[PDB]
Amino acid sequence: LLERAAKMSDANGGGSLTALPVIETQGGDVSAYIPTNVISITDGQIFLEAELFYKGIRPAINVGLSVSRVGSAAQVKAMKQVAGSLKLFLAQYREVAAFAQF
Amino acid sequence: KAAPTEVSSILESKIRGVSDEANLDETGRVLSVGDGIARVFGLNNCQAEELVEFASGVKGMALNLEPGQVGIVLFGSDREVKEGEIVKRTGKIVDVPIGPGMLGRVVDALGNPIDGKGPIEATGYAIAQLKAPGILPRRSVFEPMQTGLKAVDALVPIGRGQRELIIGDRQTGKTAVALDTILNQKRWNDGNDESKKLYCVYVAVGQKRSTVAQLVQTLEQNDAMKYSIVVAATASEAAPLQYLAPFTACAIAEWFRDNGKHALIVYDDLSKQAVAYRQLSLLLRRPPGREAYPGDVFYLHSRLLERAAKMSDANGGGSLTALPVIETQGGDVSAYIPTNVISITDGQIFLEAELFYKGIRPAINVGLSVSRVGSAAQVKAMKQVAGSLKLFLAQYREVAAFAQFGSDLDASTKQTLSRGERLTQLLKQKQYSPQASEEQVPVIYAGVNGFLDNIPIERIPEFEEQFIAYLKANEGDILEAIRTKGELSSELLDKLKSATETFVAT
Amino acid sequence: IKPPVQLFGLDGTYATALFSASAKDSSIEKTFQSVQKLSSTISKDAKVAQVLSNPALSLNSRKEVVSVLSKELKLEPVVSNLLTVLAENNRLSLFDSIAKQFSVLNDAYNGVVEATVVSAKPLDSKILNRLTKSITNSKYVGPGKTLKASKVNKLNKVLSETI
Amino acid sequence: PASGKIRAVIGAVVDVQFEQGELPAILNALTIDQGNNQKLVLEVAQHLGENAVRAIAMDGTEGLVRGQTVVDTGAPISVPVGRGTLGRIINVVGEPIDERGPIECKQRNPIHADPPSFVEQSTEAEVLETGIKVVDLLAPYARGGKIGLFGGAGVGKTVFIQELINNIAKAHGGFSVFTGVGERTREGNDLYREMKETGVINLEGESKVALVFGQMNEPPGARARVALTGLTIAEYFRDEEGQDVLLFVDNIFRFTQAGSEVSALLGRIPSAVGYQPTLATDMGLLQERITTTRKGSVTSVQAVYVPADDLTDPAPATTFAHLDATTVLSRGISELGIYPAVDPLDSKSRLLD
Amino acid sequence: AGPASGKIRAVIGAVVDVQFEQGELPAILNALTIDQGNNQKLVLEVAQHLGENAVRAIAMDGTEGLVRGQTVVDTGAPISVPVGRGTLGRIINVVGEPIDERGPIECKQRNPIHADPPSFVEQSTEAEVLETGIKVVDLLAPYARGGKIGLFGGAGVGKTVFIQELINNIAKAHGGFSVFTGVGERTREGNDLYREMKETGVINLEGESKVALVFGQMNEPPGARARVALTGLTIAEYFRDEEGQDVLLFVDNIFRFTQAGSEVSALLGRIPSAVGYQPTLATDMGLLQERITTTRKGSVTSVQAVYVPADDLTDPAPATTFAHLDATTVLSRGISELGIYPAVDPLDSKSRLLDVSVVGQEHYDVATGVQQTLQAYKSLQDIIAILGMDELSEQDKLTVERARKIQRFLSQPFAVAEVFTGIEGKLVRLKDTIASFKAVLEGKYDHLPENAFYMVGGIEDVVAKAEKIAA
Numbered sequence A: 001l002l003e004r005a006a007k008m009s010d011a012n013g014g015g016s017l018t019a020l021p022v023i024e025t026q027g028g029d030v031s032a033y034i035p036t037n038v039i040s041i042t043d044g045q046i047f048l049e050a051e052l053f054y055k056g057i058r059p060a061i062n063v064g065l066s067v068s069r070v071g072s073a074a075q076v077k078a079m080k081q082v083a084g085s086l087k088l089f090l091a092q093y094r095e096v097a098a099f100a101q102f
Numbered sequence B: 001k002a003a004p005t006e007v008s009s010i011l012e013s014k015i016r017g018v019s020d021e022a023n024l025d026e027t028g029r030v031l032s033v034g035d036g037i038a039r040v041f042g043l044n045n046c047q048a049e050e051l052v053e054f055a056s057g058v059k060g061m062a063l064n065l066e067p068g069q070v071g072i073v074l075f076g077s078d079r080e081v082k083e084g085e086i087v088k089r090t091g092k093i094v095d096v097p098i099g100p101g102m103l104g105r106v107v108d109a110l111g112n113p114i115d116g117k118g119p120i121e122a123t124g125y126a127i128a129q130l131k132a133p134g135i136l137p138r139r140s141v142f143e144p145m146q147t148g149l150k151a152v153d154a155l156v157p158i159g160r161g162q163r164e165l166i167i168g169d170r171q172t173g174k175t176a177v178a179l180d181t182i183l184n185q186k187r188w189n190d191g192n193d194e195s196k197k198l199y200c201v202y203v204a205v206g207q208k209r210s211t212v213a214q215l216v217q218t219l220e221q222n223d224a225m226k227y228s229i230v231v232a233a234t235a236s237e238a239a240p241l242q243y244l245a246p247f248t249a250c251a252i253a254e255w256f257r258d259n260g261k262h263a264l265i266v267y268d269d270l271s272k273q274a275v276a277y278r279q280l281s282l283l284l285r286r287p288p289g290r291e292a293y294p295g296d297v298f299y300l301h302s303r304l305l306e307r308a309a310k311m312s313d314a315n316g317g318g319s320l321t322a323l324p325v326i327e328t329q330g331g332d333v334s335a336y337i338p339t340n341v342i343s344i345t346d347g348q349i350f351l352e353a354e355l356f357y358k359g360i361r362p363a364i365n366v367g368l369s370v371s372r373v374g375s376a377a378q379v380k381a382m383k384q385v386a387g388s389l390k391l392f393l394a395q396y397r398e399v400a401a402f403a404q405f406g407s408d409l410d411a412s413t414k415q416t417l418s419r420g421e422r423l424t425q426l427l428k429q430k431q432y433s434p435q436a437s438e439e440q441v442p443v444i445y446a447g448v449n450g451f452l453d454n455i456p457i458e459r460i461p462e463f464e465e466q467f468i469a470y471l472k473a474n475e476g477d478i479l480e481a482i483r484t485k486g487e488l489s490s491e492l493l494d495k496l497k498s499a500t501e502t503f504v505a506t
Numbered sequence C: 001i002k003p004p005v006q007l008f009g010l011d012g013t014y015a016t017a018l019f020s021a022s023a024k025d026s027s028i029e030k031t032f033q034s035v036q037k038l039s040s041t042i043s044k045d046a047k048v049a050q051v052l053s054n055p056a057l058s059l060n061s062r063k064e065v066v067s068v069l070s071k072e073l074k075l076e077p078v079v080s081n082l083l084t085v086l087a088e089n090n091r092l093s094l095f096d097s098i099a100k101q102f103s104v105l106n107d108a109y110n111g112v113v114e115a116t117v118v119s120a121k122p123l124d125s126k127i128l129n130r131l132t133k134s135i136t137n138s139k140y141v142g143p144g145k146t147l148k149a150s151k152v153n154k155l156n157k158v159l160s161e162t163i
Numbered sequence D: 001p002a003s004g005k006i007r008a009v010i011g012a013v014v015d016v017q018f019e020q021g022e023l024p025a026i027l028n029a030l031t032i033d034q035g036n037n038q039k040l041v042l043e044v045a046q047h048l049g050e051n052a053v054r055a056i057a058m059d060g061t062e063g064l065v066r067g068q069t070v071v072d073t074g075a076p077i078s079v080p081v082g083r084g085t086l087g088r089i090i091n092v093v094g095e096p097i098d099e100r101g102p103i104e105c106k107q108r109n110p111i112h113a114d115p116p117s118f119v120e121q122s123t124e125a126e127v128l129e130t131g132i133k134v135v136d137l138l139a140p141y142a143r144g145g146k147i148g149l150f151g152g153a154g155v156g157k158t159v160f161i162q163e164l165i166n167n168i169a170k171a172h173g174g175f176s177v178f179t180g181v182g183e184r185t186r187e188g189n190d191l192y193r194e195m196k197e198t199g200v201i202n203l204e205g206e207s208k209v210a211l212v213f214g215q216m217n218e219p220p221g222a223r224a225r226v227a228l229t230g231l232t233i234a235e236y237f238r239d240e241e242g243q244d245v246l247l248f249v250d251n252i253f254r255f256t257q258a259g260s261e262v263s264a265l266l267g268r269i270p271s272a273v274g275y276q277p278t279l280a281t282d283m284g285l286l287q288e289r290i291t292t293t294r295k296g297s298v299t300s301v302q303a304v305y306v307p308a309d310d311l312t313d314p315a316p317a318t319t320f321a322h323l324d325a326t327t328v329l330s331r332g333i334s335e336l337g338i339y340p341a342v343d344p345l346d347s348k349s350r351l352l353d
Numbered sequence E: 001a002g003p004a005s006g007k008i009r010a011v012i013g014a015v016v017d018v019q020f021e022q023g024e025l026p027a028i029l030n031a032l033t034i035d036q037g038n039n040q041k042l043v044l045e046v047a048q049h050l051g052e053n054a055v056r057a058i059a060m061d062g063t064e065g066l067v068r069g070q071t072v073v074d075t076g077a078p079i080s081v082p083v084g085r086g087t088l089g090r091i092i093n094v095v096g097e098p099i100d101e102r103g104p105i106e107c108k109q110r111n112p113i114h115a116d117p118p119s120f121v122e123q124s125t126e127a128e129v130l131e132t133g134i135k136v137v138d139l140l141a142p143y144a145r146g147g148k149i150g151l152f153g154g155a156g157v158g159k160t161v162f163i164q165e166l167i168n169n170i171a172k173a174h175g176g177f178s179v180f181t182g183v184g185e186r187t188r189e190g191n192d193l194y195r196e197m198k199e200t201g202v203i204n205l206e207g208e209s210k211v212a213l214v215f216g217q218m219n220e221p222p223g224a225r226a227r228v229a230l231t232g233l234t235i236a237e238y239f240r241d242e243e244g245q246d247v248l249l250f251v252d253n254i255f256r257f258t259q260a261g262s263e264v265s266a267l268l269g270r271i272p273s274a275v276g277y278q279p280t281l282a283t284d285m286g287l288l289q290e291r292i293t294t295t296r297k298g299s300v301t302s303v304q305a306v307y308v309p310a311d312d313l314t315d316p317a318p319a320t321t322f323a324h325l326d327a328t329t330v331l332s333r334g335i336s337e338l339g340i341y342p343a344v345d346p347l348d349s350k351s352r353l354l355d356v357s358v359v360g361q362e363h364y365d366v367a368t369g370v371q372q373t374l375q376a377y378k379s380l381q382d383i384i385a386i387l388g389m390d391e392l393s394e395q396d397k398l399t400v401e402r403a404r405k406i407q408r409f410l411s412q413p414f415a416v417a418e419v420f421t422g423i424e425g426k427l428v429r430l431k432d433t434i435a436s437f438k439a440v441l442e443g444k445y446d447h448l449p450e451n452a453f454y455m456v457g458g459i460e461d462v463v464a465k466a467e468k469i470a471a
């Protein structure tokens, strides 16, 4: 059901279909039977943790867990120029935030 | 409610006549074939675990004798059998060839040669499912099994007639200990003493086709394949051939122990043999148990391991060694198939993946591996040096956590850390480099007395080759006397201490 | 010889197995009246029903009771071999299923079946089904047909779906 | 004699078909003639109906054809009891496996028997004197109960069983019965030779302990019935002669694993941790027979083995409910200078009140 | 002609029971044709035979539209596929048909997908190393030429990017032809792999190609996914036996072959095994892995990729494939989150060519020294989380800094991962990787920082990155 939502070529009309499947986990366990099967068929996943959602950071999107298989090709050129190092700044700020509690 | 056998096709035969064919005892008709299982209708005179033959040429083993049908496990592909084929009975049980003519050729699971060297001169025919030895025809383990490793001949020393398990993870030292022990018997098999030789019996079960060809080529280059049986049983065959590989290899190796010689079976591996027995039982309409296994899971491995025992003097004086390798998952030695093989064997050699990457070759944990025979099945010359080394290795393992703080060591703490590091590095040997009993007794005496504490830790590899080469040209009488007599008197202890002290000054 | 009637495959193959041997030398006409005497003398009798439905007796005791009752009834040809096969294989409890499947083979290869409306149809033994159903529907609708529905239920469901 | 015919043969389970009225009951030994063997014992499990009953063979069923003669013995698996079984190695079917001639016994008692009633039991818990200083003061053994001998290899398990059997036969006059169920092939030959050099088993003199062979090289029927064969010989000395016998089951974990193997292959569903459904019924039928009666008692000194170091498992918690004493042999002593390695704080008992 | 016509009696999912006549029933692993409403057909492979003139067949496509009593003709043999030089450059399916809209495959012969493997006497052992270009593959677990290679890893670790980067630097310069047979892949991964090979010279539509494309992702049913491995291996086995060329089979992924057979094993009448698997897991995996070996007629370097279930190497589909592979490139999910591209395990990866008699005495000491320093850093890191850096001496402080720089030096930027990293792709040779690792372990690059070796090439790229970062 998820393989039919693909971007067609120029000879087929030029249309596309985006699939947004939501996976309901149980306590953040992504290593289940229905959780691991849908994550290995889709081109990326958006992990929604319950720890950052209660503190007020809405939406709780983990930068170290959620990734996109398309990369920078599925984004606009205006947002990729001003935020070219947005993916690298999230990994550097996470390691420096834990040093303040030591 | 419903049953098989007589159904539609088979049910429309007894209504017109209660005779038709006068056989219905030595032959049968195939009614359902699939997944390596053939439901032959008939064969009332066929015994349990008897060989069969189909119309296309594939053999079978009738193991599920029902009242209307007969479940036979095909040893080949299921494409050759179809519905309505004739299946004849051989009249005999599942046997294999044995004798002294099988040495030097690679046989399969039924006794057929696959190396391409002609026929095999078989002197007898033994069944696969044979009984083990009793409690009156067994003696104590007194003979010593020379493995070649310095950490196996001193710690967990195995003997003739015992069962030493080779537990471990993936690529940690499972098949390496079994290959070095069979290649180290060239000093006794090339002579004339028949009681000192030990014929190897490598039973490759579950391995691929490329792994069986690489192991047979390495033994032929070092003159070790002339007296070693090879039981080829790859995973590309049926489930009946891989499951019966342990019983067929034990029947061929039992001919030497019943005549007056010694044998050594290496079931590689024990984890692959349990998966082949559970596959044929799940397709024969049987109830399962723990870990998707049958009810006779513990009895299938204990029956094949109890036959390799040491006979007494009234039976011939032979023995048989069983080296089953238990392939563990992730270092868990208390699993389902791991706990059954360790409780039935008289010792197990653990192999961890963390000690193999540090520098210990091979990775053999002294605190987890032990032998049930003890020092009763070892040489008297090597038992004098292994007694003091066992207490020093156990005390250094519990105090190994203080090695990171060398600036706060005391007098007794610095002596145990220096002697424990030199003893563990001296027992590390390279691949396909086994040592004799005379070369291992001189290296263990220099580290237990205190002649190796003055040397550095990095010079432990160069000191093992320098001391062994100088002892063969200057003091050759001390090395030859320790191997012939097998013990150490008062004159041998004074001559060994004077030669090691003069060579430690340079 | 296997006729195209399917009739299950395991339980329904009891009557089809004996039909191959009974279809020789004209022996299908006497098997219909002999199969009805075995079920009528066991159901409405209350004698040999309780002594055969239990899981006791033996192999020789079940064969002797079927041969003694068939010598004074209406069985002398191949009717005695049908009861001996169900006694050794423990199949005497379902004697009504073997007699009902034997009558369906003679009505399918020498007559029609199915139904139409109200009660049963006519089940003629001509040839085709298109020329036999049209000539029998006009003669059965006029004679009888008490009519004690389908067109009134379809018209009421279409009006409720559009409102 | 009641004869039968073999109808099915799927491993250890073999179905036999009898006649009308001559069908055997449950727990009935069936005789079968073979080639080199004497008689293939087959205990009856249940009856499937239609003059057929499924049985479990106690040996190898290889070579049996469909239609073999199966004679019925009329009773259960009988074994030789009395003073003639002392010093000889018996099996699960009551046959000798020591090559020292047949056991000349006057009578043969069956392995399947009921236990004592509530009116014939002991109304007070008595202590059993063992002779050791760390056993009669700390964890005292109860007269007619079960004692768990937990310990590793080389701690002193074999020396403690030989010293307790010799002290009870000289101070109280009671024999022993070593029933090694689920043992190894090399452990059975080493135990018989060590007892002859110490004075426990004399071939020409007088013995004082029975030997019951029960290795794991047989099928599931022989390993599960090894506990009933050893307990029948020890119970005869307390009911007929009146003596405090001591039964040894090495190990206790092999009796629970052998019972679930024959039950899973018959058609029964498994329980928790892959165990059999009748775990409390199979373990309680053999532990209740080793009690104290009006004529004598029967002590039990089995070696309980924990599964993967877990005391809350189904094979550890079921056997600990009937154990009155415990002989824990930790590895802390041994080489420290204690003979034997008896823990004074880990070994507890319910009779120390 | 004597066509064995069959009637459909049962249809429950992928399994379809066909009833034929007495004596004219087909054998196992036989293709059964079925006329539908379109211009194609419904291929069905016979698995087992239930009896009574009926055999259970497994459909290789959609079973929707099949009624009870349809005609099912038998082909007489197995699933034939097109072999030879005509299959190079075209996208073949599981039944041997083209799916690239480029006409029919003009093949002179058609071999079956079901065939026996090689015997023990026809096996040819070898000990040759194969250079891939990565610094962590040419120093730790080296790939063997003509053997089976397994790229183990979890979801999102780098299993698909590892097979694509190795084919753009080894398959494009090899003498033989490639065979990319994808089983259980995605719909977007099949279109991106065909467009990348045309712009690099691997698949020429108007010239000559040396790469066979075999379609068959997870968009089909369970019958087409299980038969995708046998159809792709039949074309590569003909080029190494009849033609005698070093073929390169690229399976992605190898874990989808065992999972496809377990989906239809419950409806075929088989009992389930462990973790919901089939009972014939070791028999079906050994019959397909033994046929992709190296014989006396030619070699076959299989570079399959194994997918670990939720990062678990103790599963029944991952542990059973480790005994039929020479070089195993296991990947960890913890190293991919720290910045190592790719996440190559330096201690879990093992190979048979990592000895002193194949790579030399100089290369054997460098591999043993790097593994000992990485294993010792794991034990010292646990004491720093509770005690700190005050418990370390002079030797423990220098070993912690050398282990961090050696882990980042083995991670090189791939050419196919340029859209996610940004930097250009670098390819290091086998001689440059052994010389750079031996100089850092002696004390020649102790004054350099850890950022100069991260995402770099050999010893030349590490010296240029340190001088540019200080300005």
Ligand SMILES: Nc1ncnc2c1ncn2[C@@H]1O[C@H](COP(=O)(O)OP(=O)(O)OP(=O)(O)O)[C@@H](O)[C@H]1O
Residues within 6 Å of the ligand: B169, B170, B171, B172, B173, B174, B175, B176, B177, B360, B361, B362, B363, B429, B430, B431, E322, E323, E351, E352, E353, E354, E355
């Ligand atoms: N003591 C040792 N010193 C050096 N190398 C060793 C030693 N022991 C084993 N090895 C290496 O390990 C590799 C595999 O050895 P072995 O065949 O014993 O295990 P394996 O059968 O491959 O394990 P698995 O079946 O889990 O793959 C060999 O190529 C060998 O070079």
Ligand SMILES: Nc1ncnc2c1ncn2[C@@H]1O[C@H](COP(=O)(O)OP(=O)(O)O)[C@@H](O)[C@H]1O
Residues within 6 Å of the ligand: D152, D153, D154, D155, D156, D157, D158, D159, D160, D339, D340
């Ligand atoms: N009372 C004792 N004094 C000294 N040593 C003892 C005593 N009891 C047992 N031992 C020692 O304990 C060891 C037990 O060995 P063994 O019987 O093989 O192992 P296990 O006791 O675990 O079965 C013997 O070697 C013996 O020397």
Ligand SMILES: Nc1ncnc2c1ncn2[C@@H]1O[C@H](COP(=O)(O)OP(=O)(O)O)[C@@H](O)[C@H]1O
Residues within 6 Å of the ligand: A042, A043, A044, A067, A068, A069, A070, E154, E155, E156, E157, E158, E159, E160, E161, E162, E341, E342, E412, E413, E414, E417, E420, E421
């Ligand atoms: N060399 C590399 N540098 C940076 N990122 C990489 C590299 N290799 C792989 N990746 C990342 O790993 C991800 C793998 O995604 P995908 O192929 O869907 O999962 P899998 O690799 O498990 O099949 C990609 O999104 C890609 O961004």
Ligand SMILES: [Mg+2]
Residues within 6 Å of the ligand: B174, B175, B268
């Ligand atoms: Mg191995």
Ligand SMILES: [Mg+2]
Residues within 6 Å of the ligand: E159, E160, E161, E252
């Ligand atoms: Mg992928």
